Amino acid sequence: LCTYKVKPKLQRFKLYFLGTVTCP
């Protein structure tokens, strides 16, 4: 995706904690 760019919890990818090497 990498297109929302609001508070990240809508997809959690910007938290990185689980290996989510993606942007919201």
PDB file of N, CA, C and O in Angstrom:
ATOM      1  N   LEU A   1       0.854  -1.238   0.000  1.00  0.00           N
ATOM      2  CA  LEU A   1       0.000   0.000   0.000  1.00  0.00           C
ATOM      3  C   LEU A   1       0.873   1.265   0.000  1.00  0.00           C
ATOM      4  O   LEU A   1       1.114   1.831  -1.063  1.00  0.00           O
ATOM      5  N   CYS A   2       1.373   1.689   1.165  1.00  0.00           N
ATOM      6  CA  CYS A   2       2.231   2.874   1.362  1.00  0.00           C
ATOM      7  C   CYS A   2       1.597   4.161   0.798  1.00  0.00           C
ATOM      8  O   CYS A   2       2.164   4.849  -0.056  1.00  0.00           O
ATOM      9  N   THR A   3       0.376   4.460   1.257  1.00  0.00           N
ATOM     10  CA  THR A   3      -0.494   5.506   0.678  1.00  0.00           C
ATOM     11  C   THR A   3      -1.416   6.218   1.681  1.00  0.00           C
ATOM     12  O   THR A   3      -1.933   7.295   1.377  1.00  0.00           O
ATOM     13  N   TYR A   4      -1.623   5.659   2.881  1.00  0.00           N
ATOM     14  CA  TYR A   4      -2.487   6.263   3.901  1.00  0.00           C
ATOM     15  C   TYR A   4      -1.791   7.447   4.582  1.00  0.00           C
ATOM     16  O   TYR A   4      -2.291   8.571   4.532  1.00  0.00           O
ATOM     17  N   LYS A   5      -0.625   7.193   5.200  1.00  0.00           N
ATOM     18  CA  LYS A   5       0.274   8.204   5.809  1.00  0.00           C
ATOM     19  C   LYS A   5      -0.363   9.064   6.917  1.00  0.00           C
ATOM     20  O   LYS A   5       0.106  10.160   7.236  1.00  0.00           O
ATOM     21  N   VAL A   6      -1.423   8.530   7.520  1.00  0.00           N
ATOM     22  CA  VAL A   6      -2.069   9.025   8.754  1.00  0.00           C
ATOM     23  C   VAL A   6      -1.392   8.320   9.952  1.00  0.00           C
ATOM     24  O   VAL A   6      -0.337   7.700   9.782  1.00  0.00           O
ATOM     25  N   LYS A   7      -1.975   8.361  11.158  1.00  0.00           N
ATOM     26  CA  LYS A   7      -1.547   7.513  12.290  1.00  0.00           C
ATOM     27  C   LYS A   7      -1.531   6.042  11.815  1.00  0.00           C
ATOM     28  O   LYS A   7      -2.565   5.560  11.360  1.00  0.00           O
ATOM     29  N   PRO A   8      -0.398   5.316  11.901  1.00  0.00           N
ATOM     30  CA  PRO A   8      -0.176   4.028  11.214  1.00  0.00           C
ATOM     31  C   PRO A   8      -1.020   2.828  11.650  1.00  0.00           C
ATOM     32  O   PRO A   8      -1.009   1.805  10.971  1.00  0.00           O
ATOM     33  N   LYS A   9      -1.771   2.900  12.752  1.00  0.00           N
ATOM     34  CA  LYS A   9      -2.448   1.727  13.367  1.00  0.00           C
ATOM     35  C   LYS A   9      -3.535   1.098  12.478  1.00  0.00           C
ATOM     36  O   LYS A   9      -3.879  -0.070  12.647  1.00  0.00           O
ATOM     37  N   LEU A  10      -3.990   1.851  11.474  1.00  0.00           N
ATOM     38  CA  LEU A  10      -4.832   1.402  10.355  1.00  0.00           C
ATOM     39  C   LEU A  10      -4.250   0.199   9.581  1.00  0.00           C
ATOM     40  O   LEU A  10      -5.018  -0.582   9.014  1.00  0.00           O
ATOM     41  N   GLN A  11      -2.919   0.011   9.584  1.00  0.00           N
ATOM     42  CA  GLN A  11      -2.224  -1.151   8.994  1.00  0.00           C
ATOM     43  C   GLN A  11      -1.017  -1.660   9.812  1.00  0.00           C
ATOM     44  O   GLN A  11      -0.463  -2.704   9.479  1.00  0.00           O
ATOM     45  N   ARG A  12      -0.564  -0.933  10.847  1.00  0.00           N
ATOM     46  CA  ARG A  12       0.577  -1.220  11.751  1.00  0.00           C
ATOM     47  C   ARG A  12       1.961  -1.459  11.130  1.00  0.00           C
ATOM     48  O   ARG A  12       2.891  -1.763  11.869  1.00  0.00           O
ATOM     49  N   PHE A  13       2.158  -1.282   9.818  1.00  0.00           N
ATOM     50  CA  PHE A  13       3.449  -1.604   9.185  1.00  0.00           C
ATOM     51  C   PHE A  13       4.589  -0.700   9.696  1.00  0.00           C
ATOM     52  O   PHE A  13       5.691  -1.179   9.948  1.00  0.00           O
ATOM     53  N   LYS A  14       4.286   0.572  10.002  1.00  0.00           N
ATOM     54  CA  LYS A  14       5.241   1.558  10.559  1.00  0.00           C
ATOM     55  C   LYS A  14       5.690   1.264  12.009  1.00  0.00           C
ATOM     56  O   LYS A  14       6.479   2.018  12.568  1.00  0.00           O
ATOM     57  N   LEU A  15       5.185   0.199  12.646  1.00  0.00           N
ATOM     58  CA  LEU A  15       5.643  -0.257  13.962  1.00  0.00           C
ATOM     59  C   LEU A  15       6.877  -1.185  13.892  1.00  0.00           C
ATOM     60  O   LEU A  15       7.619  -1.276  14.868  1.00  0.00           O
ATOM     61  N   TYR A  16       7.102  -1.867  12.757  1.00  0.00           N
ATOM     62  CA  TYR A  16       8.246  -2.753  12.426  1.00  0.00           C
ATOM     63  C   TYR A  16       8.480  -3.990  13.326  1.00  0.00           C
ATOM     64  O   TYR A  16       9.196  -4.912  12.935  1.00  0.00           O
ATOM     65  N   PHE A  17       7.836  -4.065  14.492  1.00  0.00           N
ATOM     66  CA  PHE A  17       8.036  -5.048  15.568  1.00  0.00           C
ATOM     67  C   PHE A  17       7.960  -6.542  15.178  1.00  0.00           C
ATOM     68  O   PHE A  17       8.671  -7.360  15.762  1.00  0.00           O
ATOM     69  N   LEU A  18       7.128  -6.905  14.195  1.00  0.00           N
ATOM     70  CA  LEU A  18       6.911  -8.277  13.709  1.00  0.00           C
ATOM     71  C   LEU A  18       7.653  -8.608  12.397  1.00  0.00           C
ATOM     72  O   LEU A  18       7.445  -9.667  11.801  1.00  0.00           O
ATOM     73  N   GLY A  19       8.500  -7.692  11.922  1.00  0.00           N
ATOM     74  CA  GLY A  19       9.161  -7.764  10.607  1.00  0.00           C
ATOM     75  C   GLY A  19       8.339  -7.144   9.466  1.00  0.00           C
ATOM     76  O   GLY A  19       8.535  -7.487   8.299  1.00  0.00           O
ATOM     77  N   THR A  20       7.418  -6.230   9.795  1.00  0.00           N
ATOM     78  CA  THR A  20       6.576  -5.442   8.882  1.00  0.00           C
ATOM     79  C   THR A  20       7.381  -4.379   8.114  1.00  0.00           C
ATOM     80  O   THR A  20       7.113  -3.187   8.228  1.00  0.00           O
ATOM     81  N   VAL A  21       8.385  -4.786   7.328  1.00  0.00           N
ATOM     82  CA  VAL A  21       9.233  -3.891   6.504  1.00  0.00           C
ATOM     83  C   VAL A  21       8.455  -3.398   5.266  1.00  0.00           C
ATOM     84  O   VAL A  21       8.711  -3.790   4.127  1.00  0.00           O
ATOM     85  N   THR A  22       7.430  -2.583   5.527  1.00  0.00           N
ATOM     86  CA  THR A  22       6.471  -1.960   4.604  1.00  0.00           C
ATOM     87  C   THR A  22       6.024  -0.621   5.216  1.00  0.00           C
ATOM     88  O   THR A  22       6.212  -0.390   6.411  1.00  0.00           O
ATOM     89  N   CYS A  23       5.426   0.266   4.422  1.00  0.00           N
ATOM     90  CA  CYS A  23       4.875   1.551   4.880  1.00  0.00           C
ATOM     91  C   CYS A  23       3.354   1.659   4.648  1.00  0.00           C
ATOM     92  O   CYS A  23       2.832   0.975   3.768  1.00  0.00           O
ATOM     93  N   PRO A  24       2.629   2.461   5.462  1.00  0.00           N
ATOM     94  CA  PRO A  24       1.164   2.476   5.491  1.00  0.00           C
ATOM     95  C   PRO A  24       0.504   3.299   4.379  1.00  0.00           C
ATOM     96  O   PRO A  24       0.517   4.546   4.431  1.00  0.00           O
TER      97      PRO A  24
END
